[PDB]
C-alpha cells in the first residue's frame, strides 16, 4: 500500500 513517497501534506 506504499506506492511512492509522500511529499507535503497528506
Amino acid at each position, epitope marked *: 500500500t*506504499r*506506492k*511512492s*513517497i*509522500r*511529499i*507535503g*501534506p497528506g
Partner: antibody
Amino acid sequence: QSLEESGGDLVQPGASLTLTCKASGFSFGNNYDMCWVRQAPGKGLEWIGCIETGSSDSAAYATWAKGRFTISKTSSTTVTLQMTSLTAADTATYFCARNFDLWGPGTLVIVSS
Amino acid sequence: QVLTQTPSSVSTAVGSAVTINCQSSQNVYSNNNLAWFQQKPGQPPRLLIYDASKLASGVPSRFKGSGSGTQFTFTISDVQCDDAATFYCLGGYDCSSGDCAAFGGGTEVVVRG
C-alpha cells in the same frame, strides 16, 4: 512540532552505528512517511529510505542501502537508522524528515582510520 | 530513476528572474510527484514546491514551478540576496518498478547585488 537527530560520531572502517530521530510536540501514532537523507560534505542530497507510521508500516530503501542499513519505529517518538560495514563513502551529515516537509538540523558521521 | 538537474550553477542579478530545469529518466509517480527545495549552508533543505506546482505554506508566490511526467522547471521571480542558496528537485516514483525516489543534483544560485 520538530525533529532532532543524535548518535553521529567518528567510527573505524567496517564498523556499525545507530542514529536516532527524536520527535517533539507530536507523536508517531499518526500517519507519516519518516525518511532519512544524507549529504556528504560539499555534495548533493542523497535519499536512504523511509518508514511509514500510523496506519501502515512499510520499510523502503535505495538500492545501494538495501540490506545494509535498517530503519524502524522504536517508540511513538523515536525512529532509528542502523548502519553496518561502514566505509569512507558513508561519511556525511544525516537528516531525518517528516513527509520531506519537516526536517531536523542533522547529525554527522566520519568514517576513517 | 535518475533526476538530471541543469544548470549546475548560475549567476544572476537582483531584480531578475531565473530558471532551473529538471529532467527525469522515467515519469514521476502519478505524473506529478515532484518537488523543489532551497538549502543554505549548514541548514537542512526547505520545501518550496510540491506536486510539481503547489506552493508549500508560508512560501512566497515569486517561487513558481511547472511541468509534467519527465520535464519540470523552477522559476524564481524578482531575485533577491536572500535567495542565494543551492536548489534541488526531488522525484517520487513507483516503488514497484524500481526505487521510490531520486534527488536532482542541485543548482548553485549566486545573486549579483
